[PDB]
Every structure is written in C-alpha cells, then in structure tokens.
Amino acid sequence: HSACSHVIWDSNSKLMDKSDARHCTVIHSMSQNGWEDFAEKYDLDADD
Amino acid sequence: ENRLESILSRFDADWTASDEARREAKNDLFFSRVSQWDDWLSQYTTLQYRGQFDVVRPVVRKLVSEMRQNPIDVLYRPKDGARPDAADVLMGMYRTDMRHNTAKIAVNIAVREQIEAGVGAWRLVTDYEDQSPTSNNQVIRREPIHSACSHVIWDSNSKLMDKSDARHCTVIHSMSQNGWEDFAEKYDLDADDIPSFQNPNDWVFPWLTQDTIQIAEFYEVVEKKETAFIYQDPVTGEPVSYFKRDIKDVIDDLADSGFIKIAERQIKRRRVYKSIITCTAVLKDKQLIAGEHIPIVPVFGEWGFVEDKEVYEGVVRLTKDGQRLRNMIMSFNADIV
Amino acid sequence: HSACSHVIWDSNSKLMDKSDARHCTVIHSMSQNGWEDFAEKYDLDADDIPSFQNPNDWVFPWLTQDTIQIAEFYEVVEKKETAFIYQDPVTGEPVS
Amino acid sequence: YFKRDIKDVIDDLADSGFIKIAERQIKRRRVYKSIITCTAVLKDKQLIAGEHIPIVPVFGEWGFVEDKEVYEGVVRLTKDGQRLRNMIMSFNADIV
Amino acid sequence: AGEHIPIVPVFGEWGFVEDKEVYEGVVRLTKDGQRLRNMIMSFNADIV
Amino acid sequence: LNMRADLETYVFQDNLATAMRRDGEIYQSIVNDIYDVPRNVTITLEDGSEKDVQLMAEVVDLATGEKQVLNDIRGRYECYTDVGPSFQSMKQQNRAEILELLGKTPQGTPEYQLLLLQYFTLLDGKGVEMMRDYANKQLIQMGVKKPETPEEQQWLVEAQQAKQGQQDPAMVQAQGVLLQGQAELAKAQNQT
Amino acid sequence: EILELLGKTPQGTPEYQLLLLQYFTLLDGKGVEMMRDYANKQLIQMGVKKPETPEEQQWLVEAQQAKQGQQDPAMVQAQGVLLQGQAELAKAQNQT
Amino acid sequence: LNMRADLETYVFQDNLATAMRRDGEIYQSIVNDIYDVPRNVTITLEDGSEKDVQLMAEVVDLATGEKQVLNDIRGRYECYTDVGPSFQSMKQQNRA
C-alpha cells in the first residue's frame, strides 16, 4: 500500500504476474520503531 | 530457401522487410502515445499550458474491454467424419500447461494492440518444466510478444494473413540487460554483449529504458522431409504404426532395436528453423524449433496490401491529426486568459 | 489482395466469372527473394527477373523495395481426351 | 513423492520402512527475497517459500510504446482540465 | 483484555498523497464551492 | 482466423515436444498380451488394446514408451481448426455442453438426465457432494451413463448390475394396469 | 443440420429423433460422453439409427440390450386395451 | 487475472508455509506398503491405493505427516486457478 510511490518494479516485462523478471524490486514505507523489530526477523541493521 | 549461403538469404530477405521496420514502425509508436502516455507527439517540458482532450482513450478502453470479456482461445473440433473425442485429446494437453497465467496474459495483450497499433502477436515456445508437466516432462507455453508497435519488421510477399508460409519474416525483441541474460539461457546466445539489429525503436529518441538490446530471430523454410521404416508398438498394443525417423535422430537407433519393419514411406514435411541473426553476423544458426510451422501468428486490425507490402493501421492513426490540432488552439487561448 | 493493382483481365467481356473469358490472365508482383523461391515451385529460372506493362500502383503511398512482375496466362485448347469406356468391378458402378 | 526443497531432515526416516524408485529430475524454480539498501545488501538470499514471486502488480491500462513500460489512471486527463477550470474560476472571483 | 488493538477507525477512500496520510468522506473539498456562493451572497447583500 | 492459424502450428509443435498420448485404447496390456490380429469389421476376444478391460490390465489412458521415449506418429493432424470461448478445465467444457443442451429439451426424462449430469460435473463440498453422489447413484448404477470403465469397477460396477436387474421387474409391475386389458382376453380363452 | 431441422418441425416421433441425434454429433468428455450413450439408448430402440459398434465387448452393448429387454414385456401389455373388445366377442358366443 | 497469478504461487508457497497437507486420495493410514508397479494402475483390490473405496477409511484427503514433521507433497500442483463468486467457507460455497 502506497504504490503510487512504491512503484519501481520491472522495466521490459511482458507479463503482469511479475515472474519473468529478476531485476524487479519493491519498496515499502515503515516507521522508525517498526524498522527495529523488522531488523530482528530478517537479520538487518537495527537503525540505519 | 530463397538463396544459397544461408546468412545471405536471411540478410537479403531482411532488406525487403525493411519497409515495415523503418517507416511503418515509426508511425506505429505514435498510436501508443495518444493512447497510453501523452496527447502531444514530440512535446517539450514547458512552463506554459499544454492541453489534452482525448475522446480516443474512452473509446480504446471500451473496445479493448469487449475482446477481453469475450476471449477467443483454442477449443478444437473433429476433422471431416472424425470421432467426437478427437478434440479432447489435444485440449487435454493444452489445458494442463496453459494453467500458468502467462498464456491468458498473452491473449489480453494480443487483442489490445490489435485495435491500437493495428498489429499484435504472440509466440509459442517449448521447454522442460515440472510445475505443470504433460508427458515426458515437456510442456508448451504461450509467451507474449508485447510492443508490437516497435517490433514490426515482419512482412509477407504472399497475400495471406496467417504468416505460416512466410520465409521473409522476422520479429525483434527489445529487452533490458537482465532480460538478455535470461534470453541467452534458452537459445544459447551471449548473456551480455549488447547486439543492435537495425534499431526500429528510436527515431526522435524519446523516453526509453537505459538498457536496450535488439536481437532478431528469423524463421526460414527448409523442408528436410522424412522417409523410410515402418515401426511397431510392443508397448500399449496395436503394432505396425508409422513413426518419425528423420525428425528424431537419437531415438531412431533404439526404435530399430527390439522391433523393426521396412516397407518404405515418404512424407514431405515443411519445417521452420529459427535462426537468431544480427546484421553484422549470425549469432546462432539453424536451431530447430519444435514447431514445423511458424509459432508466431500476428493478429492485425484493419489490414491489406499496397502492392507486395503489408499495410495496417489501428483506430488512432487519424486521431493524431485532430488531437494535436485541438491542443494547439486550447494552449494558445490559455495564454490570453 | 490488391487485385486492383493486378488488373490485366477483361476488356469488353459481359461476364465477371473469368472461367470462360477470352482475356483470362492473372499477374502477381513479388520481391527479389520471393521470385527466387517461387521459381523453384513453378520450375522457372530464378535470375530471369520478368517485367510487365505495369498495372500496379503509380500512386505509391509507401515504397516497395522490389516488385518483379510475372503474369501467368491461361490458354484454352479443347483437347477432347478420352479412352474408350471402362467398367468398375470394385465397389460396383460400372460403365464410366 | 516428497520434496527436496527444505527436506534434509525427514529424508533418512523416510528411506527406512518404505522406499520407491522411478527417481527423475523435477524442475522447480525458487525465488529469493534479498533485503537491500543503497549502501549495501543487508541480507542476501533469504529463502521465501514461494516458487514464483509472491508479488503480483496490477495495471488497468497497460502497454509499451517502445519497450518502456507505461500505464496510467483515469486521473491524468481529468486533472488536466481541473487546474485550468480552477484558474478561470479564481480570476473572476476577485472581480466579484 | 484484547489480543489485538480493539480500536478500528473506519475510513472512506484512504491512502497517502505520497507519505502524508489523507482520507475523504463525501466532504473533502466540498467546502470550495460553498464559499463561492457565500461570496456572492455576502457582497450583493451589502449592495442591496 | 489467426487464433485458428495457431492450431495449425500447435499440432506440429506440441506433438514433437510432449508427444505420446495414445487414445481410443483401453486394455493397453504391455509386452505380449498384445495382438491386433482378429477379424474384419468386428473385434472379438480381448485384443491388446481396442476396448474391454478384462484380464486385469485396466488403464485410465496410457501411451507407448518403446525402448526409448520421445516418439509419435508422423501425421500429427487430428482435428479441424476451430476456436471459441476459453476453457482450462475438462469439467468446464462439459458443463458448457450440458447448459447448451438445456433450454431446448422437453420436461420429463430428456431434461432430467441433463440436470443429474450437471450435478455430476459439479464439484464436491459438504453440500455439493450430496448432489454429486445423487447423480453418481442414479446415472451410473441404472446403466444410462454407460461408462467406458477407465478407473471405475470399484463400488460402481458392483451395484450397477444389481440396480439394472432391479429396474426391469419394477417397470413390468407399473404396466400392471394395462394387464387388465389382457385379463379380459385371458378369461375368454380359458373359459373356452 | 440437426439444428436447422429443429424449430420448423412439430412435436412427434421425428422431433424426438432429431433431439437425440444432436447429442450424438457433439463431443465427449466426462459429462458429454453420457449424452452420446443416452442418444444410442432411445435411437436404437426406435431402430431409426440402427445398432452400431459390433466390435464392442466392454460395457455399452450389454447395458443397451438390458434397456431394450426392459421395453419388450411392457409393450405387449399395452396392446391388450384394444383386445378387450375382441375378447368380449369370443366369450359371448362361446357360453351360449 | 493477477489474483489467479497470485494463487498460482499460493499453492507452491502454502504447502511449505502452513506446512503439510497432501493432494492424495483415500487409503492413507491403514496398513500399506504397496505400489502400482505390477500391472500398471489396476482397479479391484491389491490392498488399495486407489483401486477401491471405503473399506477402513472414510476420509478422502489427509495431511502428510510421514515419520518426521515439516514435510509436504512435492506435487503441490493439482488444480486450476479460477474465479467465481466470493467464498470464505465450505458452508458459504454450498449456498450459491
């Protein structure tokens, strides 16, 4: 959600299912406190 | 073939097909501007008003919705006097590997571009996959050919629309760098190289992807036929059935083992060899594709011939005249206000 | 398609059938590469490069690289072929 | 027939007391979610259970112009007239 | 006593402008058109 | 037209890659229970394919493996090219045929076979399962289904001849009211 | 051809023969294969289609014969209604 | 369409993620250690894979637990992705 500004995906993909790409990426927006607990699960930097 | 020395036959047939890839292809992307992106053609970023109207986009979306809500897909029907369960054979193997959504997406892409740019296409490919195998862990998938506006090079010197008798046709695939690496996995090409074909994409050099790799696969006609040796079935009954021998080239040895029969036979096959060639040199020559007819069947909108040249137009060709004119008068009166 | 550009038929014929016309002919234009492969089919030379009067377009809304005109002319001779009358014992129906 | 995908555990107990042949390659594809920032990749190749990407984009009016991906809403053409209408509306307001 | 936050806000159309929250009922910018009528009403009352 | 032109290149593509898929054959009986020798215009005693299931070699559908796989008939044509509405399930095409035959069949038994068949092509559930089993019972056991027995000789064929044998005397008793007319003639003959 | 004859022929035995034959000319499936067999049930009994597939030795012809044998004793009882009048003649003159 | 694309990868994700579940049939759990390698798929008793129904089972599908947990069927695929009216229970599904 907020994919008027989370849209960075694909480039040349001829499918709408996004499974013909591996250059694709998505970007999300979360809070400062939310980043700290998100870093526990996925083994990331706590604050960055 | 058209000529002896295959590389010359490709490149000379490309010359005659350059009518489509130069002039017609330039005008084809201009349909897609008025439809998808912005009303003006070759606009500039300005600090002054630039108008839009477009009755065209509600009309295009209405027409595209009709062909999507009434999709046309493979159904099959028995031959002349044939058994009624004949259709269910080929449909059984069709519905298993077309379970994947890449097939249904390709139908919806083909119908929208047919109206807009007057052209559209799709290709059939075969690969090894076991996320929906049919038999022998071999499936057939429908991959969309999308961006038919800037992928038109194909031309027929026959007056047919099917393009399954042609040998002067070629399609071009304009893809990004990562896509060129995946395209080289299947067809045994170069992962990174950046070939350029004749580039029927840019002319006025508008907004476009950073990485553009033009690669063109060609479809020639080389018969190659087949002959000789009746075979048998000691597996699943009914021995003495005619089976291929020159289509296969490994299986044929073991097919003669355990059982053999001879009475000769001649069957004339028209086979298409997919060669992937660039203008400078042939990148990979004479890969036998599973199809013996061209798997690329383009759909056309309003269509016909000049003389010995395909000509086609969508519904957006004549609207380029009126729409840019409507904006000129609008944008001038914006300054007065 | 583009039979208009291929008009070399009729003149004062009162029929449109052209299956009994005295001016029964067709013409087709094709590329340089297309003349060569079509010459294999019709058992002709591929370097002949025939030309015609030119019924084809002079308007030219779009260029065509190569047009090699050949007109296959249909001729009529009666022949009057027959050999006797023969019988058919296989699946009945003799005397044909 | 049972997976190899994350099976490195169950397989030993599964060989005992029951086994079957007809072993053959089964092609699968596995997608890998990698958390990344501009500076460096924070986590690379963290296994996500999907065999295809679990993110499906939706597009209402979609296409290419030269193989540069383009889409839009219905908002673009309507907003073009809104700001223009609003401008005329605000001019004559001050005259009242 | 909950096991989730028991407070559920109801929204109309809901989303972000980009990163700032925005939502609307049936009154959002309805306020604009009401003020144009009020403008003409107030000024012409003074003339009368 | 171009969709039908796809079906031209489909038979010469799919059958090279996928291949196999023998059809019209059941009792596909594997290395020398095989023959095909018998008899003009009729097939009697087994065969080696060619219908029956008997002698315990029933198949759903099987195909030749030879000594090496990737083999098929040279003539890959089988079907006239025709296209229409999308189908991606076998049961979806079956339902479309049932519904097409409905709305032009008269009330009573001709329309009633289509209704039971509609339930049978529909899936199971909690509720939907009962309607499918109601069709499974009526259609298969009465012998109006007339299956080709591809995987059916379990609990279905078992009760099938029992229900068929129950059906015939029950119809004779229902025609008993017409036997009243025969009774008048039986009196006149016996009184003589 | 079957659909062309339908919708212009009144109800009766010909209308019923067309209706069954429509099922027979259509595809097979799980569902559709039944209607082809249901066609052969009633059509062969009327003898208009005539019995076909003598090569059958599986199920079909067995079950087809059972439905024919169901119809036979029921038909004899139906003819006795007109025989009530003929029966009265015989018993009347016999007693006296 | 893209909802059905999400559901294509849902099957390939869910059987790992939620863990277990099978797409197999009756005779589950019960003495087996059988296969269909003799003959090739036969029906009418050999202990019962699917060769019979409803003898010491009444359950059509049951999750695969093996002898150690966190396992699933390899062939997750079985069904087709198709859109109908909205449902979120089996009871709701039956109403329509």
Swiss-Prot record, chain E:
Q: Where is it localised?
A: Virion
The listed outcome for V10 to A/T/M/Y is:
Overpackaging
Q: Any idea what job this protein has? A: Forms the portal vertex of the capsid. This portal plays critical roles in head assembly, genome packaging, neck/tail attachment, and genome ejection. Procapsid assembly may initiate with a nucleation complex composed of portal and scaffolding proteins. The portal protein multimerizes as a single ring-shaped homododecamer arranged around a central channel. Switches upon genome packaging from an asymmetrical conformation in the procapsid (PC-portal) to a symmetrical ring in the mature capsid (MV-portal). This change of conformation may serve as a signal for headful packaging.
According to the record's subunit comment, the protein's assembly and interactions are: Homododecamer. Interacts with the terminase large subunit; this interaction allows the packaging of viral DNA. Interacts (via C-terminus) with the head-to-tail adapter protein gp4; this interaction participates in the head completion. Interacts with the scaffolding protein; this interaction initiates procapsid assembly, thereby ensuring incorporation of only one portal ring per capsid. Interacts with the capsid protein.
Which family is this protein grouped under? Belongs to the p22likevirus portal protein family.
> What is this protein called in UniProt?
Portal protein
The encoding gene is: 1
Full-protein residues shown = 294 to 341 of 725
